[PDB]
Each structure stands twice: as C-alpha cells, then as structure tokens.
Amino acid sequence: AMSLLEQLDKNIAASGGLIVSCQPVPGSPLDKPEIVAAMALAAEQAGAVAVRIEGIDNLRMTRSLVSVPIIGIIKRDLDESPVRITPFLDDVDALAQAGAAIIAVDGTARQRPVAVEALLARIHHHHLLTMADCSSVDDGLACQRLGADIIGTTMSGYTTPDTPEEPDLPLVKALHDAGCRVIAEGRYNSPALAAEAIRYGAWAVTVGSAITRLEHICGWYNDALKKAAS
Numbered sequence: 318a319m320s321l322l323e324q325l326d327k328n329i330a331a332s333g334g335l336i337v338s339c340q341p342v343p344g345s346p347l348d349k350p351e352i353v354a355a356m357a358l359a360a361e362q363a364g365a366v367a368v369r370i371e372g373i374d375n376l377r378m379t380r381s382l383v384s385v386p387i388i389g390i391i392k393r394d395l396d397e398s399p400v401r402i403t404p405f406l407d408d409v410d411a412l413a414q415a416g417a418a419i420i421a422v423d424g425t426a427r428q429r430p431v432a433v434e435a436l437l438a439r440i441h442h443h444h445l446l447t448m449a450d451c452s453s454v455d456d457g458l459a460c461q462r463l464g465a466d467i468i469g470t471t472m473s474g475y476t477t478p479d480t481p482e483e484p485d486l487p488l489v490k491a492l493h494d495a496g497c498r499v500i501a502e503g504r505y506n507s508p509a510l511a512a513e514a515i516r517y518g519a520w521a522v523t524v525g526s527a528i529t530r531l532e533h534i535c536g537w538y539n540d541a542l543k544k545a546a547s
C-alpha cells in the first residue's frame with residue numbers, strides 16, 4: 318500500500334501530470350452530473366492523474382466511475398465575502414463523505430466565513446489530503462506553513478480586477494523553490510503553456526476551460542476568427 322501522494326508522484330512521472338477540472342459552463346447542455354462523470358472517466362482513460370470535481374451531485378456520480386484521486390470543491394457565492402471555493406466547514410464535511418481524496422479550499426487572506434486554518438484542520442481530521450487554492454507568494458507560503466499538502470496557483474489573477482491573459486508562471490517557481498508541492502492552475506489554455514508550468518517547477522498542472530468548457534473554447538476561436546476578418 319503506497320500513500321496517495323506517492324502514487325501520484327509515480328503517475329505524474331509516467332503519464333505527464335495532467336489534472337482535468339471537469340467543470341462545464343453553468344447552464345450548459347453539458348452541465349449534467351452524468352456528463353461530468355463521463356468527462357472524468359474519459360480523462361482517466363486518457364492518462365490524467367486526477368480530476369477536479371465541483372458539487373456534491375457531480376462528485377457522487379463521478380466517484381462511482383473513476384479510480385484516480387478526486388479533488389473535490391464546492392463553489393458558493395456568499396453575500397459579502399468574495400471567497401467562492403469551499404468556504405464552509407459543512408462543505409468540507411460533505412465532500413469528505415461523498416468521496417473526495419483531496420479537498421481544495423480558497424487559501425487567500427480575505428474576508429471569509431471560516432478561517433483557512435480551520436478549513437485545513439477539518440479536512441485533515443477526515444484523514445484526507447488538503448489543497449490550498451492560493452494567489453500569491455505570501456498567501457501560498459502562509460498556507461504551506463499551515464500545513465496544506467498541496468498549494469495551487471488557482472486564485473492568482475482572481476482576487477483583483479483585470480485578470481491577466483497569461484498564466485502566472487513565476488508564482489509556480491517561487492512556491493516550488495520555497496518547498497511547496499505546487500499544482501499550477503489557471504489559464505493553461507494550450508499544451509505549450511502547461512509544459513512551461515512543468516519547466517517552472519510544477520508538480521502537476523490542472524486544466525479546466527481548454528478541455529471541459531466547450532462554450533469557452535468556442536469563444537477563443539470566435540475572437541481570433543473575427544479579428545482575421547477585420
């Protein structure tokens with residue numbers, strides 16, 4: 318029996334280290350739990366080392382089909398706080414009972430209903446792995462110090478207006494060099510960009526829109542096609 322992290326280490330070396338976030342566009346014809354589960358299974362068959370799944374209905378359906386680790390989250394829109402990713406202790410509890418192997422939480426220093434330390438503690442005390450979705454060197458190192466197993470770059474570009482087009486590669490290297498196990502996540506919209514994250518020190522790379530958001534991909538094509546007519 319080898320630890321989940323040790324298994325992922327070996328599968329990343331063998332396969333590449335792709336994690337597919339299977340989150341279709343809200344309202345999409347493709348946003349159905351059976352379709353999310355099928356996307357996750359397809360990703361597993363294609364060599365993904367893990368999948369990210371949002372929501373309990375999607376998680377329950379996916380759990381049945383996949384054998385790779387599931388990173389679970391629940392997204393919420395809070396009345397005042399800008400935090401969205403797994404903000405509540407009850408959300409941690411629900412993901413743990415529904416079969417997530419890793420639970421990710423927003424790791425930012427922002428107004429929020431539950432302290433980051435408390436969310437991480439709740440996950441660990443379900444005997445699951447923790448992932449802190451971080452935005453900066455400072456928040457990432459704080460979450461490292463709180464004992465998060467994995468630091469994601471998921472929130473970089475999303476705490477302040479004007480999200481950059483390019484992914485935040487330097488953050489991957491800063492966190493890696495500081496001793497973090499880093500998942501690069503956010504705007505890795507081509508295989509070429511994902512490879513650059515590896516070059517910057519990523520342990521694995523999570524890709525969402527470019528694989529599982531058909532409408533979003535169509536938009537990128539329309540943008541380019543329209544400019545070429547202009």
Ligand SMILES: CC(=O)N[C@@H]1[C@@H](O)[C@H](O)[C@@H](COP(=O)(O)O)O[C@@H]1O
Pocket residue numbers: 338340400401402471472475476503525526530
């Ligand atoms: C297609 C895709 O993966 N887009 C991600 C979204 O999944 C994530 O929720 C958000 C986090 O920022 P937020 O918590 O401020 O919305 O970053 C990006 O928008």
Ligand SMILES: [Cl-]
Pocket residue numbers: 338471
């Ligand atoms: Cl996400």
